[PDB]
Design a protein around this ligand. Structure first.
Ligand code: LMT
Ligand code: MIY
Lengths: 1033, 156, 48
């Protein structure tokens, strides 16, 4: 092939041009996103039962849906919550690789058939089935700054005038409203109701009759009497449209002929569908849109389009309304793309500068330089072909491969230059001889590298999906690299390279290059002198090697493992949890204190605080809240003190003082989903008839025992909520029956007044909206209020609720959990420092085996994807190592010589380990991939040293040592060239701070440490490996 | 409400005997109550923590504290079948005939749940067999409506 | 049944249409709502 193209430079250019056009086209059309899809597909079923307690939700909705989730394919497991905000969420998680659309339609179809088994009011609200994402592209806040709109006003404006146009915008896949459109709110007054012998039942009945769509028919409809001249639709009753019309709804006609109107017993207004959340943005009422990216869409294009759409809405905003962007991943992602492009470009520059320092003429430095953009372009094309995106993982995959992808054309060119200077042969003949020396090795190397990286594509679940991004990126670049070096670079060498006279090593030159050349010629003799002495004394070096191997193991065992570096993404979270039963107003006071802190003490860092009272992550309710903090641009936050980790630590420290509330700040996970790192996720399961109380006792027993092993377990805790006081009211059936009061009137009176009730729909300015009846707040606050609600008996008399009921306090759950259809309690925790998660899970199972009869357990989430997707690592590494050996044995036609190459592995790894340890970094995916690429290149360096040595022994009859010294002499320069360019090109990532520097540091330091020791140690040790292996066999 | 009062409410409910002990030694308010007026004794009685009931009572807890609906710890203990707690409470002067806001007594609650041993104990300490709740019912009315034959005989 | 075109557009067509976002390969959407109460919404997809 290199032969073929040596005599066909135009053909070689054509292949290069096609590759570049393909890449150019691919770069234009490639999706851009922060991260690709990594979590297994999950579908969530959501339902609402206004005014329902957790038990009611569970036993009339959740269990019924769960019992119907049969005959669905590829389900891994199912979980649910039922809570006292009247809400259920069932989440079904499918095998990685499952078609998310098929998963969802199978779920939704099984649900459809369970709908007739659900309560009427639940069928009314509807049950949502949706794909579960945890990432937003951005969150658009909408605020009112002149105090003329409540959050309900704003939410309704956004729904009516903003949401749909955003949902229609190019690239947006889904839009969620933070709030609701208006509902017609009827706020009832029990005193007025009783005054006219009316109940909420009469209110509901009247609304259903006087707010309705009534079918009529046609004038002159078919079949007509013939001769009919006119055909016209008849319009009869249509829905009410306004609060005034609702106020005029007729309830009663008294005996004096006077009329009771709805507005006589109720206050009537447009309001929210729900009042559980209070949202504020720097203290001002807020709503917003949570926006997700459509599949295959370009995040940067979508954000730009979203902003354009919003701007064309701006002119029609009511006064005081303002758009605000508390969360937007796009600027962060912009920084990433540019940085990596910067890195790729200066890599191209460094190859130029390095090859020019050594080769000292434009044409020679041009040849290895040109190959790089061609390889990069080809790689994008292949990525596009495999349907990958431009994302954080694939972009860093490329810079992790810079050393490998850049090395091929450097090796080809350097060797042709060396051949000319050493034999005097013309460019073309030299290129032929040169390619003869390296082509098989370069192709074998390609096979070896494939064996190293491809198995990494075959992990399962979430980590498999992450590694795959690197694996395909790296193998592609590596593959394109050899192809380009075997097709284009030799054509260019044979045609573009200036001839070199035999013996000409530039030592006669003037100025810098002359000095450099003499310096580097003498350094090479010094180098071979050392290797000479080293090979006179290989025993001690086998000892020094074992020392390195031992040290590697030591550092490795003690390097703490994580997944992906935290970043300063310009935002972070603050959790607020007040004691159980704390009211919405109490939580608002804390949130106000929180917000006020950030806006004064961190006034130079904080852009805004978005306070959401009523929202939690592991349980909603009036006693929980969240403060989402948005910071100023990174450029305005110089130094570590003004970065999220610091800010957060400071905040968490300050909020320690706050009295009856747990308040703490924290950075966002890199990938919103996955592990807490050394964390586990455990389900305690009721396997028999046990019930909530016995399950709680078993949980407390498990927790107490866990706490007794700080050495192994740390922070093991319930994910859910504790039982709380609740108000048990018993209706006396006999007394109701004796008073002639029906149980339906009693129960809709209680529920409608105290829980609220969705009656029907009305039309507000062309949009259909809900009508809710409920007691005005001051008549549903306290137990004494119960007796102020009257029900009408059959005989006309009004009977106070107190006449036929009795009440008592008791405890019950505000949030009931289930797992795979059984009652459950999720428990979170982590391995103690120094311990593995595998170890910590093993103890948990042991402790769990001692629980009361009928109590079982299971692993879910991150843990499930380890007890299954962690049994793989061993066998994949084994396949890698076996195939590497076999490729080498084929290359060298030898079962033993492959060992002299495989021995290089620890040489790069020790340096990576030392760097990460010293810098206080972790064993993360970037560290690990960097290990692989560092190993890959050093293996390659050794493969060519050994190839050259063996060739000299085989074809020139040279001695073992003589051949080894010659080889090592010839491999020194090309090895220094690649190492120099790569080590320099990676330096910026090592030291960078701010936006995305977490990942940059993670790939940078491991690579730079690994490359330093790999290049410094290998040029002395592989000579040893080759000599010792040969002697032994 | 005090810092240690809250801790004691929580420890009493959780049945953390040693924490209660330490809290007692540190003067935590034995008469602390939450929003519904439950005291540490209410909680220990409800959840059946015998030793904490005893420690609390040794430490001056109001044996006849009532919540915002008129219910005492003896109500709770009797209702949830905690026999030994019921004996300790009565032994420490619990009102055997305490009526909550509904006119419901510990005998009513014990009878309603069919706790035969607790009924006998309550009768032993002078529970009024003829007391009527707000609907004019007695423990006997409850027993025959429940179709509990054993209990009906005890109440005769 | 029995609803006019305006009523059915407001309570049915717009309701469905505002949910027809974020579907792969959608080229365009067209609908009608008529005096029979009947609604048809057609979504046309990219040729492949
Ligand atoms: C880079 C390190 C190379 O360092 C190299 O070490 C070896 C020893 O192993 C030295 O070698 C010297 O010492 C050793 C030990 O007495 C002798 O076997 C060898 O003949 C002698 O010349 C080289 O002079 C030195 O250059
Ligand atoms: C959780 N989250 C991002 C926010 C943030 C700020 C907010 O101001 C709000 C939310 C949640 C949303 C959910 C919506 C929901 N829906 C889209 C109409 C909803 O079902 C409820 C509910 N309690 O049932 C709301 O509370 C809700 O009306 C609401 O008031 C919200 C709200 O105001």
């Amino acid at each position: 092939m290199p032969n073929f193209f040596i005599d066909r430079p135009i053909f070689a250019w054509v292949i290069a041009i096609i590759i570049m056009l393909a890449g150019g086209l691919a770069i234009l059309k490639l999706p851009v996103a922060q991260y690709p899809t990594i979590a297994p597909p999950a579908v969530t079923i959501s339902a609402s039962y206004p005014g329902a307690d957790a038990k009611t939700v569970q036993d009339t909705v959740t269990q019924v849906i769960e019992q119907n989730m049969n005959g669905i394919d590829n389900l891994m497991y199912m979980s649910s919550n039922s809570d006292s905000t009247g809400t259920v969420q069932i989440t079904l998680t499918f095998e990685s690789g499952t078609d998310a659309d098929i998963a969802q339609v199978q779920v939704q179809n099984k649900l459809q058939l369970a709908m007739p088994l659900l309560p009427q009011e639940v069928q009314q609200q509807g049950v949502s089935v949706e794909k579960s994402s945890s990432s937003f592209l951005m969150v658009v806040g909408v605020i009112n700054t002149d105090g003329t709109m409540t959050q309900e006003d704003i939410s309704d404006y956004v729904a009516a005038n903003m949401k749909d146009a955003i949902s229609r915008t190019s690239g947006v896949g889904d839009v969620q409203l933070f709030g609701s459109q208006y509902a017609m709110r009827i706020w009832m007054n029990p005193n007025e109701l009783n005054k006219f012998q009316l109940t909420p039942v009469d209110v509901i009945t009247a609304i259903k009759a006087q707010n309705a769509q009534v079918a009529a028919g046609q004038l002159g409809g078919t079949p007509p009497v013939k001769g009919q001249q006119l055909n016209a639709s008849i319009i009869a009753q249509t829905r009410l449209t306004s609060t005034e019309e609702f106020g005029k709804i007729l309830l009663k006609v008294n005996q004096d002929g006077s009329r009771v109107l709805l507005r006589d017993v109720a206050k009537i207004e447009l309001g929210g569908e729900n009042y559980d959340i209070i949202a504020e943005f720097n203290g001002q009422p807020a709503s917003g849109l949570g926006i997700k990216l459509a599949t295959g869409a370009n995040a940067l294009d979508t954000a730009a389009a979203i902003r354009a759409e919003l701007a064309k809405m701006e002119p029609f905003f009511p006064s005081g309304l303002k758009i605000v962007y508390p969360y937007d991943t796009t600027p962060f992602v912009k920084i990433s793309i540019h940085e990596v492009v910067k890195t790729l470009v200066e890599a191209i520059i460094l190859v130029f500068l390095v090859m020019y320092l050594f080769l000292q003429n434009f044409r020679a430095t041009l040849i290895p330089t040109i190959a790089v953009p061609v390889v990069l372009l080809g790689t994008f094309a292949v990525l596009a072909a495999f349907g990958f995106s431009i994302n954080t993982l694939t972009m860093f995959g490329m810079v992790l491969a810079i050393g490998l992808l850049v090395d091929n054309a450097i090796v080809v060119v350097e060797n042709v230059e060396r051949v000319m200077a050493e034999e005097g042969l013309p460019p073309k003949e030299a290129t032929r001889k040169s390619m003869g020396q390296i082509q098989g090795a370069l192709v074998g190397i390609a096979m070896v590298l494939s064996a190293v990286f491809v198995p990494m594509a075959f992990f399962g679940g979430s980590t498999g999906a992450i590694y795959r991004q690197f694996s395909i990126t790296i193998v592609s670049a590596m593959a394109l690299s050899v192809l380009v070096a075997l097709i284009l670079t030799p054509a260019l060498c044979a045609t573009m390279l200036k001839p070199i006279a035999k013996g000409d090593h530039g030592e006669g030159k003037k100025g810098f290059f002359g000095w450099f050349n003499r310096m580097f010629e003498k350094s090479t003799h010094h180098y071979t002198d050392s290797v000479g002495g080293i090979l006179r004394s290989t025993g001690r070096y086998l000892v020094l090697y074992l020392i390195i191997v031992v040290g590697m193991a030591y550092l490795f065992v003690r390097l703490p493992s994580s997944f992906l570096p935290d970043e300063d993404q310009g935002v972070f979270m603050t959790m607020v949890q007040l004691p159980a039963g704390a009211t919405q107003e109490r939580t608002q006071k804390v949130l106000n204190e929180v917000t006020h802190y950030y806006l004064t003490k961190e006034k130079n860092n904080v852009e805004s605080v978005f306070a959401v009272n009523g929202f939690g992550f592991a349980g909603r309710g009036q006693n929980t809240g969240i403060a989402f903090v948005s910071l100023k641009d990174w450029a305005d936050r110089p130094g570590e003190e003004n970065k999220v980790e610091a800010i957060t630590m400071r905040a968490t420290r300050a909020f320690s003082q706050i009295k009856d509330a747990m308040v703490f700040a924290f950075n966002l996970p890199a990938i919103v989903e996955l592990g807490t790192a050394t964390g586990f996720d455990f389900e305690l399961i009721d396997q028999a008839g046990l019930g909530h109380e016995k399950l709680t006792q078993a949980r407390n027993q498990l927790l107490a025992e866990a706490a007794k092993h700080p050495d192994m377990l740390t922070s093991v805790r319930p994910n859910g909520l504790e039982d709380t006081p609740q108000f048990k009211i018993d209706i006396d059936q006999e007394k109701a029956q004796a008073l002639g009061v029906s149980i339906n009137d009693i129960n809709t009176t209680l529920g409608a007044a105290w829980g609220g009730s969705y009656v029907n729909d009305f039309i507000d300015r062309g949009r259909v909206k809900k009508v809710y009846v409920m007691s005005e707040a001051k008549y549903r606050m306290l137990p004494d209020d119960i007796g102020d609600w009257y029900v009408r008996a059959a005989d006309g008399q009004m009977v106070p609720f107190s006449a036929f009921s009795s009440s008592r306090w008791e405890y019950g759950s505000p949030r009931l959990e289930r797992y795979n259809g059984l009652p459950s309690m999720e428990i979170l925790g982590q391995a103690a420092p120094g311990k593995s998660t595998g170890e910590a899970m093993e103890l948990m199972e042991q402790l769990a085996s001692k629980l009361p009869t009928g109590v079982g357990y299971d692993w879910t989430g991150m843990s499930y994807q380890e007890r299954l997707s962690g049994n793989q690592a061993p066998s994949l590494y084994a396949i890698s190592l076996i195939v590497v050996f076999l490729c080498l044995a084929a290359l060298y036609e030898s079962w033993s010589i492959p060992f002299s190459v495989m021995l290089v592995v620890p040489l790069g790894v020790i340096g990576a380990l030392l760097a990460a340890t010293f810098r206080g970094l972790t064993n993360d995916v970037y560290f690990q991939v960097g290990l692989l690429t560092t190993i890959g290149l050093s293996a390659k360096n050794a493969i060519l040293i050994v190839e050259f040595a063996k060739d000299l022994m085989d074809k020139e009859g040279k001695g073992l040592i003589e051949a080894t010294l010659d080889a090592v002499r010839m491999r020194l320069r090309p090895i220094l060239m690649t190492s120099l360019a790569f080590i320099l090109g990676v330096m910026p990532l090592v030291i960078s701070t701010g936006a995305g520097s977490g990942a940059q540091n993670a790939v940078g330091t491991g690579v730079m440490g690994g490359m330093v020791t790999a290049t410094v140690l290998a040029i002395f040790f592989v000579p040893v490996f080759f000599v010792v292996v040969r002697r032994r066999f | 409400g005090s810092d240690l009062g809250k801790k004691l409410l929580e420890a009493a409910r959780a049945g953390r005997d040693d924490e209660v002990r330490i809290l007692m030694a540190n003067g935590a308010d034995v008469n602390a109550a939450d929003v519904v007026g439950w005291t540490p004794l209410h909680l220990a009685a409800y959840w059946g923590h015998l030793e904490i009931v005893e420690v609390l009572l040794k430490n001056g807890a109001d044996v006849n504290a009532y919540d915002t609906l008129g219910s005492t710890p003896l109500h709770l203990a009797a209702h949830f079948g905690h026999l030994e707690i019921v004996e300790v409470l009565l032994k420490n002067g619990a009102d055997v005939n305490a009526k909550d806001d509904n006119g419901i007594t510990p005998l009513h609650l014990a009878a309603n749940r069919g706790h035969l041993e607790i009924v006998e104990v309550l009768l032993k300490y002078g529970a009024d067999v003829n007391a009527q709740d707000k609907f004019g019912k007695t423990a006997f009315d409850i027993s025959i409506n429940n179709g509990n034959e054993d209990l009906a005989e005890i109440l005769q």
